[PDB]
Amino acid sequence: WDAPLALRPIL
Amino acid sequence: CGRVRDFVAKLANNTHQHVFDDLSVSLSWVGDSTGVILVLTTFHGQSKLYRSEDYGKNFKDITDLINNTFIRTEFGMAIGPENSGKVVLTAEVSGGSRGGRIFRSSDFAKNFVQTDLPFHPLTQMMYSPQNSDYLLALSTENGLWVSKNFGGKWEEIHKAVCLAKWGSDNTIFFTTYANGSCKADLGALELWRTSDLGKSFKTIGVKIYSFGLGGRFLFASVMADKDTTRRIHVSTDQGDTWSMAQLPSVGQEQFYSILAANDDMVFMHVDEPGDTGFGTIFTSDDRGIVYSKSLDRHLYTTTGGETDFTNVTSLRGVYITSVLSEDNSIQTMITFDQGGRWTHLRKPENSECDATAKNKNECSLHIHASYSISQKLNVPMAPLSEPNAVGIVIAHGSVGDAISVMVPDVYISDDGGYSWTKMLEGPHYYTILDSGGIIVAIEHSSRPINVIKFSTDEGQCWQTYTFTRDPIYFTGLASEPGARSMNISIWGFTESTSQWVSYTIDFKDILERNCEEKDYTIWLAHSTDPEDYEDGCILGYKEQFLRLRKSSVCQNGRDYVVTKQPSICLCSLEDFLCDFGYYRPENDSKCVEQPELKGHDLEFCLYGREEHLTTNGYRKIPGDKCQGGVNPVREVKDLKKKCTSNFLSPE
Ligand SMILES: *[C@@H]1O[C@H](CO)[C@@H](O[C@@H]2O[C@H](CO)[C@@H](O[C@@H]3O[C@H](CO)[C@@H](O)[C@H](O)[C@@H]3O)[C@H](O)[C@H]2NC(C)=O)[C@H](O)[C@H]1NC(C)=O
Ligand SMILES: *[C@@H]1O[C@H](CO)[C@@H](O[C@@H]2O[C@H](CO)[C@@H](O[C@@H]3O[C@H](CO)[C@@H](O)[C@H](O)[C@@H]3O)[C@H](O)[C@H]2NC(C)=O)[C@H](O)[C@H]1NC(C)=O
Ligand SMILES: *[C@@H]1O[C@H](CO)[C@@H](O)[C@H](O)[C@H]1NC(C)=O
Ligand SMILES: *[C@@H]1O[C@H](CO)[C@@H](O)[C@H](O)[C@H]1NC(C)=O
């Protein structure tokens, strides 16, 4: 069971 | 406690079952104030698509509307922004095609239309923020396509593209390669922009490792010439002009991470060298250029991954995260003022200290967020906070001198994490509804369940209600994003053969009346000490809220404005951070020059810009909106000369 929705950009 | 009665008949006729399929569910909401939910079951070669428009009480099958094709969950249900009503599902196609095929709707999933594409997509399609008809996508051949007509007609705008993403006013940014592929040319890339959908172009950066956007700022990591290291550079103007940040350079094993961002400032994690599993938080100024060590030994895993860093959205200035001791134990730190000062969370009054604590009487609360979960502790949900539900913070935790491995209880705050209390014994799943009118909770158990707990008085008193005769193995909750509805959906499956199911409960008849000018009370935010004149002055101002009474029982409503009023405090020295080259030696004192500028301080003062390098040693905290009071009288001083003084310069 998944219910997808702010990811943190990695540099 | 437990004053609400005559409640069984109120929930019974509002409970609404609906069954699906034999034992990959995938749920996406479509637009605010619609009730449109889309389930995509996937058998793995078969798919089945469902659709409510009454907040998940009743569904209807629309597998037919996608010509009963197999859909790839990998990309998942690409939902458009706002109430644009747009849904795009990416179909599996038989191998050896020219390109892929997509099922797309622009009418809240009433009429899907088939569309073959000129390319095979590698990513989910990205909806522009400005205009919902404008999509982009990156092919398997690393080619950036764009469509102006909601994915009808696609135009390939560049040939070799590693990463692309939208910005404000339909501007596309992206990174490109030359000789090899992406992984080989990592470091030797260049960063483009197009203002006008790939008609015009501009090489806004070179020798790039990677790029990213947070709030107002464009960030880009850049490799140094004759070195394996890289440095972050910041543009506030879509990459026309650039300035190197006042942050340390890092190697190829280490990373940067935009923990959080807005118009005012950015929290920046910088990994510590040597595979340590931690780094250092730095908070920016309004320029995004000068940084300031907020927190040491901030826990953040190898190769990106997980952190406990958490914006407590239910109060201004509040952020929770987790840090590692020298000991090699994990403690949870809270900041109430945008990462100026950090500290331990207050121990709950209704709790004894666990086995981690040296002292039995005295300890602190610790919070289970993404790290606890990753390490397979018995933690169903990370912390929860809704901005409309002012004050309210719900999370799992341990009470002691560190995070403990024991099965945690659920603790709640009503004031943005100054004070706490045990909400429920043992782990639960939780959802806030109607802006803090009703909190709702389901137990996490090995064996199946049939009951749901609810609290009208913000966690202080709970009421049990049996929502089903034949019990279910619970999997998750689903509510309408925004946390303004009163329509929870309880998902699970039957005892093992087995199949999916969803009991959806309206709470309309429980909160029978709407609220009134009598139900709300005055509440000051950030109340340290009322006897002080400057009580509640975070970032140079106070806020006083109208807040729903705990005792009172009513619907706030879908159109509930959070009523607050500011009070602008006087500026002290504390409202100013120290600009580059200065520091605070004594605790609570003036910003004064550091004599030895070393490390990346010395790097900035040499390699930099004179504008940021000349200063009176003070800048206003970003987002700090004080008036009057102290203003830095000190004379300006150019710091480049002092640094270059020591070097013999060529004629
Ligand atoms: C931590 O969380 C809070 C709450 O989520 C963030 O504050 C919110 O910031 C947003 C974006 O800057 C503000 O949005 C507003 O949107 C309306 C409508 O478009 C617009 O009229 C306003 O000018 C503004 O852009 C919002 O005011 C604000 N919300 C609250 C409740 O304070 C905060 O930015 C987060 N911190 C970080 C570093 O991301
Ligand atoms: C929980 O779910 C129920 C549905 O299961 C939601 O009911 C909705 O209630 C509103 C009335 O307040 C209906 O709004 C419509 O508004 C338009 C424009 O004003 C009007 O022309 C229509 O005649 C209608 O009144 C809406 O259709 C209705 N939904 C259904 C399926 O009947 C309810 O909003 C949810 N509860 C909360 C608190 O969000
Ligand atoms: C609930 O719904 C049923 C079926 O429509 C009806 O018989 C009953 O009168 C309703 N009200 C109550 C209070 O049970
Ligand atoms: C299925 O796709 C075909 C394309 O050949 C289309 O003509 C048809 O309208 C679709 N099915 C239904 C039942 O409409």
Side-chain angles (χ1 to χ4, degrees):
Chain A
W1 191 92
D2 298 310
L5 278 65
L7 281 102
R8 308 195 149 87
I10 292 155
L11 303 96
Chain B
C1 184
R3 288 197 178 182
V4 182
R5 289 188 181 179
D6 302 320
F7 71 93
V8 179
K10 291 184 161 191
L11 295 172
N13 273 24
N14 293 304
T15 312
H16 295 114
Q17 189 191 337
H18 190 91
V19 199
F20 300 87
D21 286 302
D22 68 300
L23 267 69
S24 282
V25 172
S26 191
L27 203 82
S28 279
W29 291 75
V30 185
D32 194 58
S33 316
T34 73
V36 180
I37 317 169
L38 277 166
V39 192
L40 185 63
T41 318
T42 308
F43 309 92
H44 195 79
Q46 198 200 336
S47 290
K48 281 189 161 180
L49 188 69
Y50 299 83
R51 187 187 173 286
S52 174
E53 63 174 45
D54 57 341
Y55 291 79
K57 293 170 178 176
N58 282 279
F59 289 76
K60 192 184 172 179
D61 194 306
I62 59 168
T63 315
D64 51 293
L65 290 190
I66 61 164
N67 282 36
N68 51 255
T69 317
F70 190 57
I71 302 299
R72 293 188 52 182
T73 319
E74 297 83 297
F75 302 111
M77 293 175 282
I79 318 309
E82 314 287 347
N83 294 1
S84 67
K86 284 170 174 78
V87 185
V88 174
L89 316 189
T90 311
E92 171 97 54
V93 301
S94 52
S97 305
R98 293 193 176 178
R101 174 180 302 180
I102 58 172
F103 288 96
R104 61 197 188 77
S105 156
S106 57
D107 59 335
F108 298 82
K110 290 170 181 181
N111 292 262
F112 278 91
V113 51
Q114 192 178 121
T115 304
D116 293 291
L117 303 172
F119 61 99
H120 294 276
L122 184 53
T123 67
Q124 193 173 47
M125 263 144 213
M126 259 64 84
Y127 293 67
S128 182
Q130 189 67 14
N131 201 310
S132 69
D133 286 317
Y134 289 51
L135 307 181
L136 61 83
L138 199 142
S139 68
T140 51
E141 300 186 318
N142 307 139
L144 174 56
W145 300 76
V146 180
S147 171
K148 304 180 206 192
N149 60 341
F150 181 53
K153 287 171 182 180
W154 296 82
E155 298 184 317
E156 179 162 288
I157 63 162
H158 214 272
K159 192 179 170 185
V161 178
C162 289
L163 174 63
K165 43 191 71 170
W166 290 109
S168 301
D169 294 301
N170 294 117
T171 313
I172 307 160
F173 299 86
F174 59 93
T175 46
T176 64
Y177 62 96
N179 291 319
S181 74
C182 291
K183 286 188 180 180
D185 301 316
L186 176 58
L189 306 184
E190 48 182 308
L191 173 69
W192 300 69
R193 181 194 70 199
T194 174
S195 301
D196 48 25
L197 312 175
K199 190 180 174 182
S200 195
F201 283 114
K202 187 166 192 292
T203 51
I204 62 163
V206 297
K207 56 180 191 180
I208 306 299
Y209 180 98
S210 186
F211 85 107
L213 311 96
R216 194 156 52 80
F217 313 97
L218 169 58
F219 292 109
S221 48
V222 183
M223 290 278 286
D225 67 319
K226 206 189 172 182
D227 215 326
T228 60
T229 59
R230 65 189 190 285
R231 280 189 135 286
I232 198 173
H233 287 70
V234 195
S235 172
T236 47
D237 59 339
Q238 311 183 314
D240 287 312
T241 62
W242 294 88
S243 281
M244 69 143 63
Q246 194 234 336
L247 283 162
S249 55
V250 299
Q252 294 184 120
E253 86 289 3
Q254 296 161 264
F255 64 99
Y256 301 120
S257 175
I258 302 283
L259 288 169
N262 59 19
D263 295 308
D264 298 325
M265 55 73 67
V266 62
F267 292 80
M268 193 77 78
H269 175 79
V270 181
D271 194 62
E272 198 68 9
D275 307 318
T276 54
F278 60 79
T280 304
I281 309 180
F282 297 79
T283 54
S284 87
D285 62 358
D286 59 295
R287 293 171 295 192
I289 293 168
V290 179
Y291 285 79
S292 183
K293 184 185 280 182
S294 182
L295 188 64
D296 291 297
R297 303 178 73 76
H298 178 227
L299 217 175
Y300 209 119
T301 62
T302 54
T303 71
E306 300 89 336
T307 179
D308 289 344
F309 187 87
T310 309
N311 182 349
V312 177
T313 54
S314 71
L315 194 67
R316 182 187 58 103
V318 185
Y319 304 82
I320 292 158
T321 195
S322 296
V323 285
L324 201 70
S325 184
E326 265 61 34
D327 190 85
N328 214 62
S329 52
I330 312 160
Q331 299 88 51
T332 298
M333 294 282 101
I334 187 158
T335 177
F336 300 107
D337 63 319
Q338 207 160 254
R341 189 174 179 173
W342 293 81
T343 173
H344 291 266
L345 283 81
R346 181 187 311 181
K347 163 195 176 60
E349 63 189 321
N350 195 43
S351 277
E352 277 107 52
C353 300
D354 69 19
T356 60
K358 74 187 174 182
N359 199 302
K360 197 185 171 183
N361 289 315
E362 301 203 315
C363 59
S364 36
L365 183 64
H366 296 270
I367 306 298
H368 297 291
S370 307
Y371 193 85
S372 295
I373 289 158
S374 75
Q375 299 286 290
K376 309 193 174 179
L377 285 182
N378 200 50
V379 179
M381 276 196 172
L384 181 64
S385 62
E386 299 290 358
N388 45 310
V390 63
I392 312 305
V393 192
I394 301 158
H396 297 84
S398 103
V399 177
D401 296 355
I403 299 165
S404 76
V405 305
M406 288 77 94
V407 171
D409 308 310
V410 178
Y411 298 82
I412 194 177
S413 189
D414 69 333
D415 55 349
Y418 280 98
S419 66
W420 295 83
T421 316
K422 188 174 290 194
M423 193 184 83
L424 294 173
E425 203 174 43
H428 293 71
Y429 298 76
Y430 37 77
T431 295
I432 308 167
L433 292 179
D434 195 64
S435 321
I438 327 179
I439 316 180
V440 178
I442 290 288
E443 194 184 314
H444 183 44
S445 190
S446 292
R447 294 179 187 173
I449 55 96
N450 65 331
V451 291
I452 192 159
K453 321 196 179 198
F454 67 91
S455 188
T456 55
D457 61 341
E458 300 182 352
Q460 286 185 352
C461 281
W462 289 86
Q463 318 301 130
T464 309
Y465 162 68
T466 307
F467 71 88
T468 181
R469 291 180 184 179
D470 302 310
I472 52 157
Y473 280 116
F474 175 88
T475 55
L477 296 175
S479 56
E480 193 201 45
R484 292 172 175 285
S485 71
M486 301 165 78
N487 288 316
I488 196 76
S489 301
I490 312 156
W491 294 75
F493 46 82
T494 56
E495 257 176 310
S496 206
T497 47
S498 289
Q499 50 171 8
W500 293 100
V501 59
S502 75
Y503 299 83
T504 298
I505 312 175
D506 201 328
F507 289 87
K508 189 168 180 181
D509 298 318
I510 300 285
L511 299 182
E512 69 187 317
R513 72 190 178 75
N514 301 33
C515 303
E516 297 133 65
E517 219 297 89
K518 69 189 181 179
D519 296 306
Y520 296 85
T521 177
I522 317 313
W523 182 70
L524 179 60
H526 300 273
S527 192
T528 318
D529 172 45
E531 288 177 1
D532 199 290
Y533 175 51
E534 299 180 299
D535 182 36
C537 298
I538 304 302
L539 259 61
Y541 64 99
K542 321 184 176 194
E543 289 182 310
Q544 282 162 283
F545 288 79
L546 292 182
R547 274 192 67 177
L548 179 65
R549 275 174 218 279
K550 299 212 186 288
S551 54
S552 176
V553 182
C554 54
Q555 190 183 26
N556 289 320
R558 287 201 63 73
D559 302 305
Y560 165 68
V561 178
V562 179
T563 302
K564 51 149 174 283
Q565 72 184 6
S567 302
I568 302 305
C569 312
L570 290 183
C571 307
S572 50
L573 290 169
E574 295 145 308
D575 296 282
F576 300 91
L577 69 82
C578 306
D579 211 322
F580 174 65
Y582 299 69
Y583 79 112
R584 299 179 191 285
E586 301 296 337
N587 294 321
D588 191 52
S589 68
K590 304 182 190 175
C591 297
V592 293
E593 284 187 65
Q594 73 195 64
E596 295 188 314
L597 281 74
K598 290 181 172 174
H600 75 275
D601 302 325
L602 188 57
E603 293 195 314
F604 182 80
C605 193
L606 297 167
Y607 303 83
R609 290 200 192 268
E610 84 302 342
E611 288 176 49
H612 316 306
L613 191 44
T614 198
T615 176
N616 64 34
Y618 288 100
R619 196 181 197 77
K620 293 172 183 184
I621 285 164
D624 190 303
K625 301 203 168 190
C626 64
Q627 285 167 31
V630 177
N631 191 287
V633 182
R634 204 82 167 196
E635 294 185 319
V636 71
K637 282 200 174 188
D638 183 52
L639 295 173
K640 199 182 163 188
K641 306 176 183 179
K642 78 180 294 183
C643 296
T644 60
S645 163
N646 299 327
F647 291 73
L648 176 73
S649 59
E651 300 180 300

